[PDB]
Amino acid sequence: QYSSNTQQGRTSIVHLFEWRWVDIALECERYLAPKGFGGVQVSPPNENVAIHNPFRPWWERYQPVSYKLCTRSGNEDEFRNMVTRCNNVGVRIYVDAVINHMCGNAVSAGTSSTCGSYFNPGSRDFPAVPYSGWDFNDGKCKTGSGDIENYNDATQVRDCRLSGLLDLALGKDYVRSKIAEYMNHLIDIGVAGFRIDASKHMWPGDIKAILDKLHNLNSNWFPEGSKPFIYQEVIDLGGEPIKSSDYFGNGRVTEFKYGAKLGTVIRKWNGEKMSYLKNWGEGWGFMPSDRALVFVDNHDNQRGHGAGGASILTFWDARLYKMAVGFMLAHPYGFTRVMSSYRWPRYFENGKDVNDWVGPPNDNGVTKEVTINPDTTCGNDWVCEHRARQIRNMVNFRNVVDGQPFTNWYDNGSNQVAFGRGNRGFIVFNNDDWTFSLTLQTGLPAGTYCDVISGDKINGNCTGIKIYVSDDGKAHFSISNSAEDPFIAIHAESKL
Template identity: 35%
Template sequence: MRKPQFVLLTIVVSLWLVQGQKKPNFAANRSVIVHLNEWKWADIGDECERYLQYGSFGGVQISPVAENVIVKGRPWWERYQPVSYNLTTRSGSESQLSDMISRCNKVGIRIYADVIFNHMAALTGIGTAGNKAMSDVKIYPGVPYTPEDFHPTCNIPNYLDPEVVRNCELNNLRDLDQSTQNVQLRIVTYLNKLIGLGVAGFRVDSAKYIATEQLEEIYSKLNDLNTSFFPPKTRSFIYQDVPVFDNDVIGNEGYAKLGNVLESRFSLAISRVFSGKDNLTNLQNWGPDWGFIPTNDSDSDENVKSPIIYTDGSCGNGFVCEHRWPQVRNMVDFRNAVSGTEIGNWWSNNEQQIAFSRGSVGFIAFANGGNLTEKIQTGLAAGTYCDIISGSLVNKTCTGKSVVVDGKGVASIRILESDFEGVVAVFVNSKK
């Protein structure tokens, strides 16, 4: 089985949006959203200016922006326990959030806010802005919400009844009644405030637990995006958390009509392929492409820290910064270049080795076992190309492998089982 980078690179290759859904509002010639989970707002602004703007990255998904209950040990999940819609969190203040959004927009990097309005905190306590969460009596003065704004207390025993799923409590989180005008007003006011600050869109947490007609009402009341950063009449990019479980009567089709959805099954299927449980050739007839892979993993620990950036571009102080790995950055450039092209010249050994082209722009080969030494049609023009996995094109020189394409578009592809990465990727921008 290959290193974790192998799977991450495959993810980048396969990212594209559901046809007919809302646009992500990327600046020109940019794509791919980076999740800088649990980063401070000021540090995200720094990262936009010192790194992200210089590649093809399109935007950053940030951690939840609203006040949350403070939990002992400061686990990541406390940020999904809202106390109010005050924009003060351990990532920073409202002014720091506003400054970061402006800084990133100015260098072409869009910001997508993770928002929670299915529920309020299950725990009683004090929030990051000093407001109280009195969950036992369903009172949240910082909004304010009172018991009349919530559904009756009940659990979700299974996913067989849509009414139960949407009107009962997920893990004892106090379930808001989005059918009421007061709740809708509070939510819309909150989201419109973020739009005013310059966000490009929203990840809607726990959207599955809200009726689609109520979400549609809320989305319809949102303002157009801030014209300081976006063209007039630009609408928010919406992508929704809609997990699908076994024996689940609520699919994601109704939500896909309102915006994009997060396809929770995608990461499981990818992991099965690259762990050798399923055949790599299964990717030839891949299902619908939903565009994102959700994760709750955090690069930092219980207290939000700032990453240390070393001279080689890597991160320290407990951060991994996968987006800074050269292979990932290069593959974001690859993805941006091949966007809109068709998959062609499919090749496989009918086991754990595949290769294909993306139009006449790019070519990639994977070997998840054994040595791959084959002459394969790349679809590319004749010339010498730098492999962007083992290295890069720097001053017309390949720092890693070279791939020579002949006049017929054929190249000798060589991936050894001992190679650190089981991938070779070349595209027009890596031609010497």
């Protein structure tokens, strides 16, 4: 469950949050395959409640009504088409699995669902599964409200309703079997693994029991005996009884400490500075590298949901965000996930974004297609971080340097730092209020390299900055503090 199952020489996943299946399929073929992306995390593909107050929020997708593959992203046919087309170009699909719960207990009964299935939350009736009152934790939960009231109590965290979401009785074989049926449908279609949503809210042993029922990966694309990649969403920032380590038996785990700390460093808040990144990774108290799923922001915390945090960097803070993503993609710690977002009308009132609920770009609830502008950016309010040259070229940097050790670290005791990855790549950052101008040991063979942050290598020349590495591995770097992108990266495949 720890192996990504990506094509050899591909090392990242991109979250195409709320994208439609037909758009992901095209993106696999036209962009992700040729640019060396490993795979795509997709939004939950199962049927959810259609929530009309507020208007079609992104979070309606975290309120299941059934396991039919029928959502605003598309139907089962389009989902199958996408997984096939992506695998056929060597790009994997990872599904956001919403398995802890069904919908909110106060949602009105009827057919307000993305495939029109009937459901009745008040009577615990979900006949399109089917589930009944016997399949939820109402009798098991010991809180007065029936909801989770206290994260200091590990038992209620697992057995009670997260924010009122109907909590499935994952201790029962019947329920485990219905979930496994859903996951095996996805595996057989060709999915390479799963983000297990709300993992903290399930017993590690119930997750195990479900995983035990799963098929091996589809034997047309994956070697015989291949198991789905599992990464579990557990928010563990310390101070609670439940630990990220409790879930290592099942797969990798999201390391939320990573983006919180990195955002603080890059913002130069709380006395932090880039020179302190010398021991980044387990040195900062993070989980083992071979279990961490890392990221700068995710779909929750980029809009203040989840653990939130003021330090989180997002596309809204573009200059600092690209730097943070660049550092993440250069550094060997963890398995890297890149966020790809849409714009929404952020509006702060009393410190909170009152529009943190807004769903994807839409026409009366119908998700907009991803349009491609002439300069390869996206239209229709999709941000497409993964198409920014500075981020896309760093995704390739990570591929090029895969397996190479962290070496040749330099820092100025403040915010000018640099490091290499064996003899295959080198990166330099200036986050101080003055120019970074210095000759550094790069560890690279002698030659002329294209900086892949400012430009690209094409037909024997560079479109941006060129770096000249001499016979002894040394090169001069000059980065103004007023640079729009104050970092430079060179690698084996950017050499002229």
